[PDB]
């Protein structure tokens, strides 16, 4: 069991949103908290062993230290990984303008065949939300209902856990458009 088992990565197919790419999801690399501890460096290496170019992190300096992975971003830095920090409040949802950057950058990476991996702490909340959003974002035909099942298929029936997340998903398309204010 645990910590010395190589770091898992759930590869989500983006074909049903008509993309050939795959997006990757995992839990905090190196996380040491509640019945969960690991080796940052080692996990971090396995990723590079795994082929990872770009990495999207949704924690917060606040969280990186609380899980004892302060330098995480750096270990990523000096490991060949282009990291994109996009903290999302814990137990929260991103503001549309932030959530928007994520979709963009994320999309680009894929458009440009980059081995992209995303994560927050638990990988069952924030990251599922964000991945679910990219589905609604690469397709105007896919239903919130569906994208959810997509992640549930990927990560378990505990996919989008919260209700705030569920609501957020059903309103992403609107709020995203409502970001119509080209300005």
């Amino acid at each position: 069991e645990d910590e010395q088992t190589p770091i898992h990565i759930s590869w989500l197919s983006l074909s049903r949103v008509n993309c050939s790419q795959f997006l990757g999801l995992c839990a905090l690399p190196g996380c040491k908290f509640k019945d969960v501890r690991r080796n940052v460096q080692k996990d971090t290496e396995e990723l590079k062993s795994c082929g990872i170019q770009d990495i999207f992190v949704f924690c917060t300096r606040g969280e990186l230290s609380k899980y004892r992975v302060p330098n995480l971003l750096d270990l990523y830095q000096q490991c060949g990984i282009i990291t994109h920090h996009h903290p999302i409040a814990d137990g929260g949802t991103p503001d549309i303008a932030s959530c928007c950057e994520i979709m963009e950058e994320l999309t680009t990476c894929l458009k440009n065949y980059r081995k992209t991996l995303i994560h927050s702490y638990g990988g069952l909340g924030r990251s599922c939300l964000v991945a679910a959003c990219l589905l609604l974002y690469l397709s105007d035909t896919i239903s919130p209902e569906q994208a959810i099942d997509s992640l549930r298929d990927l990560r378990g029936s505990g996919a989008i856990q919260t209700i705030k997340q569920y609501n957020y998903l059903h309103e992403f398309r609107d709020k995203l458009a409502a970001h119509l204010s080209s300005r």
């Binding site: 908290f33 509640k34 019945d35 609380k66 814990d90 137990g91 927050s120 702490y121 638990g122 069952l124 909340g125 924030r126 029936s157 505990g158 996919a159 989008i160 856990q161 919260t162 209700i163 705030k164 569920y166 609501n167 059903h170």
Partner: protein, 296 residues
């Protein structure tokens, strides 16, 4: 390492174990708990300081007697009053032939009270669920894991890592509302009650949106009428489906008139309308409430 006798594992939930044991002297029972820090750990274990506290301030019949505690630096242990098994066990080991309609009430009743006792001390249990309700040979039922027990007015706070069970959460908390009340505990029991009855857990949850909908699909998609002020509840949405109440006729037929009105009120949407712990211990339903002794 302490004059004692670890014999059997009565339990082991969320980072911790609850071995059974005897006084390495005159024996005389024991439900010795256990919890672990190891120093160089996150802010000491809170699991407990407050839980040992509230356990002290609280001293009532239907409330586990925290006999003692051994503060050892290595790992912290809490001597508890051993008590055979919890209600999940019992409930389970009875789910085919059911539980005695009386023993049920004898059990619910001793609970409402013990509950209303804490409530009266300005406390919310919050972790009410079968595995946390203990029973004994004579038909006596106590409360436990005051591990999430806090004093009135604690706010609802959610964490990415804090991913719990939910089977027993009340609609006001799922729909998002700063802080919670005692109405919550009178809802966990709502469920738990209708579960000793029908034998199967009332609303099984995997995601908050499922937890709800189940409830709504069973208890009707609440409208302003039954619950003044929903359509304003942070995470409410006109969009959710609108399931018309699934009349008790399917919900708990094994019951009667009293039970079927209590539960009804015991699982009311409006927290401000949901019945009180004391207002419960009254109800005609508990009239001839004896203390059936169970068989295990």
């Amino acid at each position: 390492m302490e004059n004692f006798q670890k014999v059997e594992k009565i339990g082991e939930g969320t980072y911790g174990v609850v071995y059974k044991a005897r006084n390495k002297l005159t024996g005389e029972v024991v439900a010795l708990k256990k919890i672990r820090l190891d120093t160089e750990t996150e802010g000491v274990p809170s699991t407990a300081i407050r839980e040992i506290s509230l356990l002290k301030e609280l001293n009532h019949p239907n409330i586990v007697k925290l006999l003692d505690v051994i503060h050892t630096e290595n790992k912290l242990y809490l001597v508890f009053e051993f008590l055979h098994q919890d209600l999940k066990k019992f409930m389970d080991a009875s789910a085919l032939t059911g539980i005695p309609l009386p023993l049920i009430k004898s059990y619910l009743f001793q609970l409402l009270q013990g509950l209303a006792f804490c409530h009266s001390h300005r406390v919310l249990h919050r972790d009410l669920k079968p595995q946390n309700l203990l029973i004994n040979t004579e038909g006596a039922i106590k409360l436990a894991d005051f591990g999430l027990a806090r004093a009135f007015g604690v706010p609802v706070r959610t964490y990415t890592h804090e991913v719990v069970t939910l089977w027993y959460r009340a609609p006001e908390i799922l729909l998002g509302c700063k802080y919670y009340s005692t109405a919550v505990d009178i809802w966990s029991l709502g469920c738990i009650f209708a579960e000793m009855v029908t034998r199967r857990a009332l609303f099984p949850g995997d995601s908050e949106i499922d937890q709800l909908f189940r409830i709504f699909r069973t208890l009707g998609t609440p409208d302003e009428v039954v619950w003044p002020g929903v359509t304003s509840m942070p995470d409410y949405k006109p969009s959710f489906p609108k399931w018309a109440r699934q009349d008790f006729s399917k919900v708990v037929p094994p019951l009667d008139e009293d039970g079927r009105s209590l539960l009804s009120q015991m699982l009311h949407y409006d927290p401000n309308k949901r019945i009180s712990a004391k207002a419960a211990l009254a109800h005609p339903f508990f009239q001839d409430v004896t203390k059936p002794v169970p068989h295990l």
